[PDB]
Symmetry: C3
Subunit: 185 residues, 3 copies
């Protein structure tokens, strides 16, 4: 089936390089069909919450990716809005996004990004910078092209499948989609 993905750029910071960066990476990473629902909003908690609820409840998105507003400054409230609309928390996503980003963002531990589930959709908070967005998703390789640290998207296809969503496949040259034998078609 077609995967429906919501993309939210919290433009609190123009070149909203946020949406375009996600569109570019996803188009390169996915081999199965998908459709996008894009939104550009300010860093105001109530508006972010409404936007996430609109995309999951009304637009029936299977996956929602946000960019921006995840730092320590008082204005940054994307993770707060994300936890507020969640039905269940996925601690490993925030933890590992920070371990992955320790490789390309010296102050990565200052981020408060989370991954949560609302209904049957997965919502992940990503950085605002395009380079950081792609490195978090795809991970880190060496000069030869070998994977040193797997990206966060390597576990996304299987998570969507466990949430009873569409069967998602990726281009291994970009990112390999992990899946146990008891889940491969």
């Amino acid at each position: 089936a077609t995967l429906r993905i919501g993309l939210v750029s919290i433009s609190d910071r123009y070149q909203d390089k946020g949406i375009p960066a996600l569109e570019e990476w996803l188009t390169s990473a996915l081999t199965t069909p998908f459709e996008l629902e894009t939104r550009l909003i300010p860093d105001e908690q109530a508006i972010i919450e409404q936007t996430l609820c609109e995309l999951v409840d009304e637009m029936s998105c299977h996956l929602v990716l946000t960019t921006g507003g995840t730092g320590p400054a008082r204005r940054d409230v994307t993770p707060d809005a994300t936890l507020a609309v969640a039905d269940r928390e996925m601690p490993g996503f925030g933890e590992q996004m920070r371990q992955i980003s320790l490789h390309f963002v010296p102050t990565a531990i200052l981020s408060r990004q989370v991954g949560v589930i609302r209904k049957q959709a997965l919502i992940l908070n990503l950085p605002g910078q395009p380079k950081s967005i792609k490195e978090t998703l795809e991970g880190v390789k060496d000069a030869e092209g070998n994977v040193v640290v797997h990206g966060i998207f390597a576990s996304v296809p299987y998570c969507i499948q466990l949430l009873e969503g569409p069967y998602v496949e990726t281009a291994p040259e970009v990112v390999a989609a992990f899946r146990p034998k008891s889940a491969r078609r």
Copy 2:
């Protein structure tokens, strides 16, 4: 003294390889005496909560290890039941169990396992697969037998001691029990 351990297999998934796998590993790892209280239950939150409370409060277990029901799927509610009966959270156990399992489970970050304390007992959530159960507890070694990443059980004996429980010792060939000079007998 004898260590009392509760083993809970949330058979929501037969071969309940869960209880047997824990019995096998513990018997090999511990050099001090222990007794087991085993339970096989469905993946229903209220039943898991009652079982954990029965084992800690009524059976006076010092340590409780659970297997199964820790994924993102809505049915999986072991971590939810565990947090519900907790008096205090131990964040490092869930975090490090996921770092350890990143070595043998490609999608390890999808787990929501926790470690908590209820009264004076420690409760840890483990995977459902026998191989993953043992690797989390014992950690990872190289072909030579050298420890690359210490297992989660390396810190369990000292934690029980700090919780005023029995003095627990392990077979170093399986797993070494860490303890500061100010705690060694």
Copy 3:
């Protein structure tokens, strides 16, 4: 401007090597001016909460560092007091303090240390032992002096700046203060 730092030793454990160890390290690490507000208190939750509130609200501290009372034992309640006075949690600080300390404290995962924000101040919980206090802050190097794992203080100057505090600089021979081009003066 001058950075105001509160130092709290939860002497629940004399040689309160806690305050002195922080005074020694900070004096060596900082190249910009600072002033200290020191306190030595027992491991009693209400007293720790009052002390943190006194230092942030009344003494206008930009940064507060605590030492001691972060283990699993029931008496240890520094992290509980810290979360109780917080306006916002910084998950990456607790997570990374535990990853850093995995190098010098075998049972590092037993710690429940957190990093939080109250008003515009950052509060971080550190170990009780002087050696562990300094290694957490400065990180780990090799025999040659190369940084293998960056200390937690490498991200503190930038965090204070994002919280609208004074411009803090450090001696790179001790610890380098990370900062993006869009923040360097």
